[PDB]
């Protein structure tokens, strides 16, 4: 049961998520590196006590900035578009 509690990290809010929230009712949040489609779906049904429809998984490469005279690179984080039905709470 503890596996489904460490799959999420922090909610992702942006200008694109606010548009699809009032149209298709789909929220997006940042998850960990793992967390397949069977672990993210089972976590929303208990933590958010709401029903979903489809959960997608995709990983993006970390951006590389030019901070000072030393090169730096961040990490890769996975996102997921939590698609809800007609009645949601948050």
């Amino acid at each position: 049961e503890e596996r489904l509690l460490k799959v999420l990290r922090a909610p992702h809010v942006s200008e694109k998520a606010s548009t699809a929230m009032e149209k298709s009712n789909t929220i997006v949040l940042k998850v960990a590196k793992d967390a397949t489609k069977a672990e993210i779906k089972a976590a929303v049904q208990k933590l958010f006590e709401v029903e979903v429809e489809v959960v997608n998984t995709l990983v993006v490469k970390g951006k590389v900035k030019r901070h000072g005279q030393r090169i730096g690179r961040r990490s890769d984080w996975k996102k997921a578009y939590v698609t809800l039905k007609e009645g949601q709470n948050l």
Partner: protein
Amino acid sequence: MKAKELREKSVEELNTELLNLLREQFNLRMQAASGQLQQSHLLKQVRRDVARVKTLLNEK
């Protein structure tokens, strides 16, 4: 608190470890990301508590 749970059995100490992760760990992270977590020291305190409980499980 370090020796308070040192005399606890595995089942009950495993349970509080479960509760520490489910509540006050996941919820805190959401609040911090969303920006309504005024006080951040809770994240430090809960993380250390989880480690302290976890080491006792392995030690026991």
